[PDB]
């Protein structure tokens, strides 16, 4: 298992070998919206 990108290994990000970052945290996101009398909705919104 490759050495995880620490703060002493991140200097290898900028040599000639092209590197990508994949942040998939924000892919599935929701909004939780209340009206007081009745009920409560959760709208899935777009992510990235």
């Amino acid at each position: 298992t490759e050495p995880y990108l620490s703060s002493q290994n991140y200097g290898e990000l900028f040599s000639n070998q092209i590197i990508w970052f994949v942040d998939d945290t924000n892919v599935y996101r929701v909004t939780i919206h209340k009206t007081f009398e009745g009920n409560l909705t959760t709208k899935p919104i777009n992510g990235a």
Binding site: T25, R29, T31, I45
Partner: protein, 34 residues
């Protein structure tokens, strides 16, 4: 606050050994012939 825009992360978590989480012992007319 509205806080509109909140991530979710669907994971296959909660794998354990099926014992207790905190290792504790959680404890909580009649018939008649005439």
């Amino acid at each position: 606050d509205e806080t509109y825009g909140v991530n979710v992360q669907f994971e296959s978590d909660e794998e354990e050994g099926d014992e207790d989480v905190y290792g504790e012992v959680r404890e909580e007319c009649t018939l008649s012939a005439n």
